[PDB]
């Protein structure tokens, strides 16, 4: 007794309503956005890359890295559903399973441990936990992971900033602001290292 | 086979809704704004040019450099469609192609390779790659190219500032901030060389 067609449409329209929530919480969008935010503030440029471009890059990146799970949903939950092979209730479960598996690969056991105790449910295996518990654990792990990557990328720009300030202080020109002179070198290092292609490749490879 | 009048209208309104995205992700708007962002940052003025006029000049600059491609879209796609020479499906493809060609002229081979492997698809010719994968490669190349131009624009202003600081220190006045003295010199040398006209030539002509 699968859900009637009227209820099936009502469920799907509700999922489209929560589409921003699914992208910003259940996907890779948050980690990429935060790492780009740290990198932008690491250099002297405040909002030169602009917010729309940063989100635009992240949206394409989060679509590419989640193409495997997106295809797995299609090949196991959409095509059997359209071919009249699985109950609509079964198809919904078949779509949710790869999404849960992907979120578990990028989560930390400490995050699961605190939220499982917070929910107060007696579950032992770290695979049959509810989405209500998994999603906050996943987004917490993504924020912490983004900070680690953000600190990693920040260090070389801190090195340049300290060197420029030290060299200027060596000549006794303490009045000269190190930030104005430091910025072209920060652009210099990031461009001869091929930073933009490098960071997006690492962010793509990070989700594994 | 061809889309009905009702459906064609729906597609037209949809592209108008995404019009800001097409400007800042497919056209030359991103490179111009980033380069102009460096120019404002290089000089001692922080918000003095203000954000409004920079975007407005960038929009007019884009319409100038996109005029060949926009006219090519007009001739190849709009004119047969208005005269009812071709169907809506092929007219849309005839409009998409000039945009794809322009994005290929402003991208790099390495950037395309990274994203085509990232998408996990099969292709052998760059000319028939999907626009969904070309867009992230296009802007990534645009950001790297803009940083290169901005770095070159930042050097002469750094040159002026370092000279003024050295002169003041050499004269013995270790108490005066170089920024106040250097700012008129940076502005004077920006005007008597007609700096913006030179930047227009190296920015508008950089696409070709």
């Amino acid at each position: 007794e699968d859900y009637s067609v009227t209820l099936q449409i009502l469920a799907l329209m509700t999922m489209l309503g929560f589409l921003p929530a699914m992208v910003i919480l259940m996907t890779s969008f948050t980690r990429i956005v935060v790492v780009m935010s740290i990198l932008r503030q690491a250099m002297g440029l405040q909002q030169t890359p602009s917010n729309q471009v940063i989100i635009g890059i992240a949206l394409f990146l989060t679509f590419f890295v989640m193409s495997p799970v997106l295809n797995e949903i299609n090949d196991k939950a959409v095509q059997p559903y359209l071919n009249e092979q699985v109950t609509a209730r079964e198809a919904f479960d078949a779509a949710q399973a790869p999404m849960k598996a992907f979120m578990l690969k990028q989560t930390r056991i400490k995050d699961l441990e605190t939220f499982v105790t917070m929910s107060g449910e007696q579950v032992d295996n770290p695979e049959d936990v509810s989405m209500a518990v998994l999603i906050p654990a996943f987004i917490t792990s993504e924020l912490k992971t983004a900070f680690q990557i953000g600190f990693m990328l920040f260090l070389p720009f801190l090195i340049i900033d300290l060197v420029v300030a030290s060299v200027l202080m060596a000549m006794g020109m303490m009045m000269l602001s190190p930030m104005i002179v430091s910025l072209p070198f920060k652009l210099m290092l990031f461009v001869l290292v091929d930073g933009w292609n490098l960071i997006l490749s690492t962010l793509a490879g990070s989700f594994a | 086979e061809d889309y009905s009048v009702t459906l064609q209208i729906l597609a037209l309104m949809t592209m108008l809704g995404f019009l800001p995205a097409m400007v800042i992700l497919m056209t030359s708007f991103t490179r111009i704004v980033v380069v102009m962002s460096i120019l404002r940052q290089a000089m001692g003025l922080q918000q003095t040019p203000s954000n409004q006029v920079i975007i407005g000049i960038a929009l007019f600059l884009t319409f100038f450099v996109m005029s060949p491609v926009l006219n090519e879209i007009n001739d190849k796609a709009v004119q047969p469609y208005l005269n009812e020479q071709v169907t809506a499906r092929e007219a849309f493809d005839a409009a998409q192609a000039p945009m794809k060609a322009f994005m290929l002229k402003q991208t790099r081979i390495k950037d395309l390779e990274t994203f085509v492997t990232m998408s996990g698809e099969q292709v052998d010719n760059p000319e028939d790659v999907s626009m969904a994968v070309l867009i992230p490669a296009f802007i990534t190349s645009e950001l790297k190219t803009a940083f290169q131009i901005g770095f070159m624009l930042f050097l002469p202003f750094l040159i002026i500032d370092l000279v003024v600081a050295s002169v003041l220190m050499a004269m013995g006045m270790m108490m005066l901030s170089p920024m106040i003295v250097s700012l008129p010199f940076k502005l004077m040398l920006f005007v008597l060389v007609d700096g913006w006209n030179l930047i227009l030539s190296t920015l508008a002509g950089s696409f070709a």
Partner: peptide
């Protein structure tokens, strides 16, 4: 695949409109 999902949906709507007209 998933990309063709949107294409199939639009074609069905176009076919339904074409038959209705």
């Amino acid at each position: 695949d998933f990309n063709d999902l949107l294409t199939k949906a639009i074609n069905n709507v176009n076919t339904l409109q074409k038959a209705s007209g």
